[PDB]
């Protein structure tokens, strides 16, 4: 009725969708961004890729959408679908690995005045720093910049909307844990050109990694091996009868250490941990190495151990006596006096190396835990 | 000017692309096709997949494209957008594993006459036999037929154009090498239907495969494992005192090659070959087992080598004489003589079945090499 | 020109013909539609999860009464082409195997007969969840059932009436195609108060299993078994190889364990039955047990596991005395038990070893029955 058909048709005719609500040569189209990650689905620190939930709150005004009693008078605020709207080519700077998912053909709301919001339920593919400094106990801050993609601060400008945590909807299924995250605004003008360039939202993800299951399995076969090597020390000094017997273990155990290496480097390759983490294992594991080789070479270190009728009796007794000598010689080879030395020599070494391994372990755990 | 609007307008009205330049009830549409292959980026012998590029040189004629001083006169040869063309649904009969890529949205060659060509830099994934007989030394010729998809002879016809090799631009980084490549045409009518069916170009790729990597490591552990087997045989002569030691190395050996066959199945099923090959390794190596079977079984083959004062002097030397003839008994078994026949018995037999392995192996390559 | 411009203007396919309207001569019984199924290839089989990727030639037929042409259409050429959007196309749904939309068997070029009859038949790369069940492994290897038909229309808007499966069975499959019957039908159901959509029911009864796993897998068993078999022959020829004999247990043991490990791996990739999987692991355990037996049986026994006259009598004393020790050991040796051991190892290997291929047969006979 009330100019019913005349209302609706007029609107269609003189209105070009593609036109950008440019208002004189100035303020650019003022458009603000506001991301609220509802939640995260999955991440790969190794490949620094994340699939996340984002509701993008996009705001801007088109004074061409203002109305009178025949549009606003009809029903204050209403639902108009996107299409007709000029969609900022939003883009995560050093990220952007994937298209915005569910950004397309959604709707928006127009007020009696004009103000419009476009907030389609997104979830997409991301790309943020993790560097080999993300899995640390001391984390790294995922630097993520967002802003207008192909338009300049003269044609348009993307601005921020508010502060909010990243652990606000951080995934509890993540193999990592959050410290804090902040985001502040910025305008990037380049010494290149004397012009005034796009605006941007810079995310900073500060989170520290490593789920604790890993922790237990690995350090315990170490104190495990510690005891066998501990036995590697005590077994010899309290019984050199099974030196070779331990030859076996030395084989079974470094190979155990070798195969643990396949498993944890793929972990290494599975998750990017700051290499300086690797040196822990480096000297630790390798002392199992230098100590053995010496301990067991030393274990090994030892030469071979690892009237007339009366005279008859004395030529015979003399035979038993110098072989008597001989027996004592090889025993004069494998002494039990210094195998005790190596026992405390290295156990203090191990309690040193060990407590030294615990050192930096404990130390930056004095930093991380904080 | 020169009938400017009158010439391009008339052309669009009475011109159609859905249609094919059919000329009376005869030879079909004269389609000229050919392979111009210049790169083979990826292929898998195992899955017999091939993603290569071949510009689809098509050549046929449409009189309707003939012109006078107002199109020919304009500029002899003019290239029209492909859209105006009836594009055949060409496809790799036993291949076609992938869409041709880069053919859409392209340029078409038109002549004053009507001649037309359009060589598209088509890249696509293919699927042709390689079977387990793909990579031998004696090759297999992958049968690759190509021709119209859903159109029968009564409407479109294609034919070869020229012979060109497959090695004309074959991959020098290929894990294979070519010998020859032939392509002849034909038309296939089927006993099913009394009708005259599609035409097609059949390529045959004749090329021998197999780098030598897998080769070097199959035979190294073999000679090396034959060294320990050789040790297997020689030790009882030079150190039978380590027969058990021998046992250890058979648990060693055995596990190693049982593990060698693990690699085989992975690699083999990971990279295709005619089974007849592994047959070589099969018995040859079951031979080291069959032989260690007998040889160490034989090695362990042997029962256990695997006045009155004058009186006791006699009860005593008696004690000694009894045992002495007895120790003679265990040596009575380890005669140190048959040990030399067993290494020589088998040294020759392994030098012979090795030379046997060597035989068909080299015979087969005196066949391949060809 | 024979009324051609005018006539195809008469048909105007899209404009004059109702493509959104199916010419079923209005509300009646149905448009006589017929489907033809021909597998062009089977590329992948997954026995474990009852899923198959296979290609089919979707041969389709139905008469388009508004398609009938006249001289400058019909007789001008008693056969011509017309795209999918200009040809009524049945909405053939792979009834129990289309849980993976059809590809390039979709909106493709169709064949236009002269008197309305039309023909559309392109290629279908599809995925299916055929009746594998854990019964698609016994030797019959079940019967894979599939139904094809025009999904949307019912018994008063569509009627589809009705080729071997091995006609294009893939030769690189790990199975064998024994038969493939084809019979159409139509059917209503309980909640529906009317009959509808007719369909192409095609059962594929197949079979599979390698003659290769048998090769390298039983191979080690008679080889390994002879080790455990020799194990008991070897306790005689030289049981003194105690430690070294022990080594072999570790070694024949580690061999045994991961051999079984490779077994489930290929297993998960294949739903293996409980009947067969036990004979494998049951018998390797037979040796595993006897390896443990090997243990004890091999280390089981407690031990085998006048002044001058005065002085030498001392020695004859020390003589005899430890001769008692020496012998306390052969008491344990237990050697007249030797043959019986390896004889009662032979007997059982024969019993069980036979029991298996005995059972092999007692189930090998009835299928061949």
């Amino acid at each position: 009725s009330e100019h019913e058909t005349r209302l609706v048709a007029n609107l269609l005719e003189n209105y070009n969708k593609v036109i950008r609500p440019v208002e004189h040569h100035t303020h650019f189209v003022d458009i603000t961004v506001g991301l609220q990650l509802i939640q995260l689905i999955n991440v790969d620190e190794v490949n620094q890729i994340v699939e996340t939930n984002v509701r993008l709150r996009q705001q801007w005004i088109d004074v061409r959408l203002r109305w009178n009693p025949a549009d606003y008078g009809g029903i204050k605020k209403i639902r108009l679908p996107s299409d007709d709207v000029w969609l900022p080519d939003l883009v995560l700077y050093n990220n952007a690995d994937g298209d915005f998912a569910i950004v397309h053909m959604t709707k928006l709301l127009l007020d009696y005045t004009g103000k419009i919001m476009w907030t389609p339920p997104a979830i997409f593919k991301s790309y943020c720093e993790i560097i080999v400094t993300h899995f640390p106990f001391d984390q790294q801050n995922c630097t993520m910049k967002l802003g207008i993609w192909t338009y300049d601060g003269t044609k348009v400008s993307i601005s921020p909307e508010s502060d909010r945590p990243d652990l606000s909807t951080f995934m509890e299924s993540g193999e990592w844990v959050m410290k804090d995250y902040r985001g502040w605004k910025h305008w990037v003008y380049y010494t290149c050109c004397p012009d005034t360039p796009y605006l941007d939202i810079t995310y900073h993800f500060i989170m520290q990694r490593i789920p604790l299951y890993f922790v237990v399995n690995v350090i315990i076969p170490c104190l495990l091996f510690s005891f066998l090597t501990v036995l590697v020390f005590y077994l010899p000094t309290d019984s050199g009868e099974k030196m070779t017997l331990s030859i076996s273990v030395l084989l079974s155990l470094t190979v155990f250490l070798l195969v643990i290496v396949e498993l944890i480097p793929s972990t290494s390759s599975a998750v990017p941990l700051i290499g300086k983490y690797m040196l822990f294992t480096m000297i630790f594991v390798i002392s199992s190495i230098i100590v053995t080789v010496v301990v067991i070479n030393t274990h090994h270190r030892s030469p071979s151990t690892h009237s007339a009728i009366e005279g008859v009796k004395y030529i015979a007794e003399h035979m038993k006596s110098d072989e008597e000598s001989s027996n004592a010689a090889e025993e004069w080879k494998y002494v039990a006096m210094v195998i005790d030395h190596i026992l405390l020599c290295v156990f203090m070494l191990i309690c040193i190396i060990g407590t030294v391994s615990v050192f930096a372990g404990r130390l930056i755990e004095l930093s991380q835990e904080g | 000017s020169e009938h400017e609007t009158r010439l391009v307008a008339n052309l669009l009205e009475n011109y159609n692309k859905v249609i094919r330049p059919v000329e009376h009830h005869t030879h079909f549409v004269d389609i000229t096709v050919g392979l111009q292959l210049i790169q083979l980026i990826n292929v898998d012998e195992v899955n017999q997949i091939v993603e290569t590029n071949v510009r689809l040189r098509q050549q046929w004629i449409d009189v309707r494209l003939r012109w006078n001083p107002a199109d020919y006169g304009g500029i002899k040869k003019i290239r029209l957008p492909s859209d105006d063309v009836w594009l055949p649904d060409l496809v790799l009969y036993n291949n076609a594993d992938g869409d041709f890529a880069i053919v859409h949205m392209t340029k078409l060659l038109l002549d004053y006459t009507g001649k037309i060509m359009w060589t598209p830099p088509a890249i696509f994934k293919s699927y042709c036999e390689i079977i387990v007989t793909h990579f031998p030394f004696d090759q297999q010729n992958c049968t690759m037929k190509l021709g119209i998809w859903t159109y029968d002879g009564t409407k479109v016809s294609i034919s070869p154009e020229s012979d060109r090799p497959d090695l004309s631009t074959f991959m020098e980084s290929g894990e294979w090498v070519m010998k020859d490549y032939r392509g002849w045409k034909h038309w296939v009518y089927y006993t099913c239907c009394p009708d005259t069916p599609y035409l097609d170009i059949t390529y045959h790729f004749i090329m021998q495969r197999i780098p030598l990597y897998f080769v070097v490591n199959v035979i190294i552990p073999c000679l090396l494992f034959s060294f320990l087997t050789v040790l297997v045989f020689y030790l009882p002569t030079d150190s039978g005192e380590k027969m058990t030691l021998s046992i250890s190395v058979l648990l060693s050996l055995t596990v190693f090659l049982l593990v060698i066959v693990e690699l085989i199945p992975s690699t083999s099923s990971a990279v295709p070959l005619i089974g007849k090959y592994m047959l070589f390794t099969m018995i040859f190596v079951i031979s080291s087992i069959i032989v260690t079977v007998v040889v160490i079984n034989t090695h362990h083959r042997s029962p256990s080598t695997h006045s009155a004062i004058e009186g006791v002097k006699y009860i005593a030397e008696h004690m000694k004489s009894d045992e002495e003839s007895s120790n003679a008994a265990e040596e009575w078994k380890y005669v140190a003589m048959v040990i030399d026949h067993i290494l020589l018995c088998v040294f020759m037999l392994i030098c012979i079945i090795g030379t046997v392995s060597v035989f068909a192996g080299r015979l087969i390559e005196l066949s391949q090499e060809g | 020109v024979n009324e051609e411009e005018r006539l195809i203007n008469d048909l105007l396919i899209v404009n004059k013909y109702n493509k959104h309207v199916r010419p079923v001569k209005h509300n009646n019984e149905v448009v006589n539609i017929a489907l033809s199924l021909t597998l062009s290839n089977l590329i992948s089989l997954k026995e474990t999860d009852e899923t198959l990727t296979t290609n089919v030639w979707m041969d389709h037929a139905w008469y388009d009464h508004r398609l009938t042409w006249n001289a400058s259409e019909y007789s001008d050429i008693s056969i011509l082409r017309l795209r999918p959007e200009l040809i009524w196309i049945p909405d053939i749904v792979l009834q129990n195997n289309n849980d993976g939309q059809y590809n390039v068997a979709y909106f493709c070029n169709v064949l236009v007969r002269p008197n309305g009859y039309v023909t559309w038949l392109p290629p279908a790369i599809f995925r299916s969840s055929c009746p594998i069940n854990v019964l698609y492994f016994p030797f019959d290897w079940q019967n894979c059932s599939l139904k094809f038909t025009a999904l949307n229309y019912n018994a008063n808007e569509i009627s589809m009436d009705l080729i071997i499966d091995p006609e294009a069975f893939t030769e690189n499959g790990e199975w064998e195609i024994i038969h493939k019957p084809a019979k159409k039908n139509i059917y209503g159901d309980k909640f529906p108060n009317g009959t509808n959509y007719q369909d192409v029911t095609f059962y594929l009864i197949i079979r599979r299993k390698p003659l290769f796993y048998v090769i390298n897998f039983i191979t080690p068993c008679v080889l390994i078994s002879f080790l455990a078999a020799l194990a008991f022959y070897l306790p005689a020829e030289s049981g003194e190889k105690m430690s070294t004999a022990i080594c072999v247990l570790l070694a024949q043991a580690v061999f045994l364990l991961l051999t079984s490990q490779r077994l489930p791996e290929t297993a998960l990739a294949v739903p293996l039955i409980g009947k067969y999987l036990m004979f494998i692991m049951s018998l390797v355990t037979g040796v595993v047990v006897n390896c443990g037996i090997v243990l004890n049986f091999h280390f089981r026994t407690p031990s085998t596991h006048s002044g001058i006259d005065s002085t030498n009598y001392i020695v004859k004393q020390i003589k005899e005395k430890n001769a008692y020790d020496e012998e306390v050991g052969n008491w344990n040796l237990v050697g007249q038990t030797i043959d019986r051991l390896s004889m009662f190892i032979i007997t059982p290997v024969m019993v069980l070893g036979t029991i298996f291929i005995f059972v092999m047969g007692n189930f090998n006979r009835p299928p061949a029955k």
């Binding site: 084989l251 190495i289 015979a316 | 020098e172 030790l235 005192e241 | -």
Partner: protein
């Protein structure tokens, strides 16, 4: 200012698929350039890569210089993709995957008819890295890209610095490094014999890699391994008799470890590129380790066995003593360890040599290409 009429005027005559070519004999002036921003996947064994390229596209078409109502209004315009001549880009030698987000994006029409456009593109390509690129001397990655549509007699591409870089935004998480990026603008005439040149864009990228992490995983194990065998070598002189087999247990253990390595890193090179030089030192320094290793058992294999009534009976017993002595004497002339002791120093210096030969040469293959 005729703002409406002007827009409506040209759109009247506005021509889509026609190039802004003054006439037909001197082509148009097209500007292009690429700034790398993401090198997503380096699969050198197959010679392929994925990069987010800034496709700087520029050209001229005054077909739309405007008046006061559009040129003067703002010397800057952002008009839709589908609305002006667009270079369908691709890398002759590289682009193996149609560009992603490299097209259909807002272009830029200044006021004089200057056109600027720059979409980001993730796409696949195939640069060199053909049995080389793993050295220390690097194979320059040469990628030439151009429109794959028309040829330089109508189209002409421009470029800039051919001296200045790929490391501009070369990824920091790459297992490699770049040292120079040269680029030339050129005509079309290749090995394949194509004429009518369509100019293209050459992309040199000589880059370094090899930042070994596996190096010392390889370096410490081998030393531990060498020492282990040198244990096998010197440990015998130290070790007891129950050590011959001791040594054996090590061989078993030594190579269990060995081919396990042979299985580990071989995998490495297949998933990534490959090269034989570094490969040669390892397996052959490795085969020599194995060689002198089994040699050792053949060395601890070599040697023959080390692998009145009163007096008549006092006579004979004094014989068992001298008799058995002759026997223990056997042991003597047999196990006088000249070969063994010397075998230690044998492998020792041989060790030093194998090592020096290798690390000295590794010094060279890092020092010539340094």
């Amino acid at each position: 200012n005729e703002e409406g009429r002007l827009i409506e005027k040209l759109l009247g005559d506005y021509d889509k698929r026609i190039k802004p070519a003054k006439t037909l004999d001197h082509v148009i002036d097209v500007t292009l350039k690429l700034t790398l921003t993401n090198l997503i996947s380096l699969n050198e064994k197959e010679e392929a890569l994925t990069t987010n390229v800034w496709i700087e596209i520029q050209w001229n078409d005054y077909r739309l210089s405007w008046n006061t109502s559009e040129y003067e209004g703002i010397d800057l315009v952002r008009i839709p993709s589908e609305l002006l001549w667009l270079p369908d880009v691709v890398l002759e030698n590289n682009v193996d995957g149609q560009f992603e987000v490299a097209y259909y994006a807002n272009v830029l029409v200044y006021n004089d008819g200057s056109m600027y456009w720059l979409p980001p593109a993730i796409y696949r390509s195939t640069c060199p890295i053909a049995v080389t690129y793993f050295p220390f001397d690097w194979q320059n990655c040469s990628l030439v890209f151009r429109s794959q549509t028309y040829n330089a007699h109508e189209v002409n591409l421009q470029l800039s610095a051919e001296e200045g870089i790929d490391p501009e935004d070369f990824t920091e998480n790459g297992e490699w490094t770049i040292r120079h990026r040269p680029a030339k603008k050129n005509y079309n005439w290749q090995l394949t014999k194509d004429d009518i040149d369509f100019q293209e864009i050459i992309f040199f990228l000589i880059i370094q890699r090899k930042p070994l992490f596996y190096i010392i995983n390889i370096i410490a194990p081998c030393v531990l391994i060498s020492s282990l065998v040198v244990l096998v070598y010197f440990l015998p002189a130290q070790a007891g008799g129950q050590k011959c087999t001791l040594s054996i247990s090590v061989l078993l253990a030594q190579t269990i470890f060995l081919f396990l390595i042979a299985q580990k890193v071989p995998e490495t090179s297949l998933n990534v590129p490959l090269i034989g030089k570094y490969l040669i030192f390892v397996m052959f320094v490795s085969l020599v380790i194995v060689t002198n290793c089994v040699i050792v058992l053949n060395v601890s294999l070599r040697t023959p066995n080390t692998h009145s009534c009163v007096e008549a009976c006092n006579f004979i017993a004094k014989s068992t003593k001298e008799q058995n002595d002759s026997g223990s004497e056997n042991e003597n002339w047999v196990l006088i360890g000249k070969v063994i002791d010397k075998a230690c120093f044998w492998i020792a210096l041989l060790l030093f040599s194998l090592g020096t030969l290798a690390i000295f040469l590794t010094g060279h293959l890092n020092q010539v290409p340094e």
